[model samples]
Target: TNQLQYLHKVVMKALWKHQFAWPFRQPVDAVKLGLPDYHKIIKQPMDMGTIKRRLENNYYWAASECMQDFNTMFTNCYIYNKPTDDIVLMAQTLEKIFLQKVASMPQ
Candidate 1:
């Protein structure tokens, strides 16, 4: 779990840095409004090597953490309590929200 957390942090930081460049060097409005005067945005492909390294070294730990979190949430909302049809609906809503946010970002 520690290794998974570390890898997650590393990948998240890399993604943020690669997307935003120097953090405080630009304004939020500039990024959101697509201001032409701001620094040009660059889109890079994912670093597969880093991901492969994580998977090779910490596959079990990573999988365990993911499964545990999923089961915990599932148990809390469904297993220990009464099941509801709202699970799929809520999941779909969350998926749509994620898709919308990712789609709105600069390509």
Candidate 2:
């Protein structure tokens, strides 16, 4: 479908811009550069905070609510299971679906 193709193009463009790469690498480079380190700088879970702020401000209410609910459900499961293969796969599938939905939104 044209919509899906368009979404793929948009996501590919975003990946090319290194948006995801930067966040993953910044912590490593900060350590190498003798910076206070990403952990110390934030002193809290930065990814969750960043994602929460973005979801609250930028995403649709339904998407934000679904993601939050999914997180809560996963956390509850994790407290006992440590996420076995099946659970991890389920989580990843849900996460990809959520990310695609968010990516499809107008920025």
Q: What is the lDDT of residue 8 in candidate 2?
A: 36
> Which pairs in model 1 have colliding backbones?
none
TM-score of 1: 0.23
TM-score of each: 0.23, 0.31
lDDT of 1 by residue, 1-107 (tens): 55455334543334334422222122224557565543343122122233334445764454444334323332333322224556444433433443344343332
The runs of at least 3 residues in candidate 2 whose Cα sits more than 4 Å from the true structure, single-residue gaps closed, are 1-63
Q: Which stretches of candidate 1 lie over 4 Å from their true place?
A: 1-84
Candidate 2 lDDT over residue span 1-107, tens digit each? 34333333453234324423333211234456565644454432322334434443544344444346435433433343345646455445544554665566553
Please report the TM-score between candidate 2 and the true structure: 0.31
Question: What are the lDDT figures for the candidates, one per model?
Answer: 0.37, 0.41
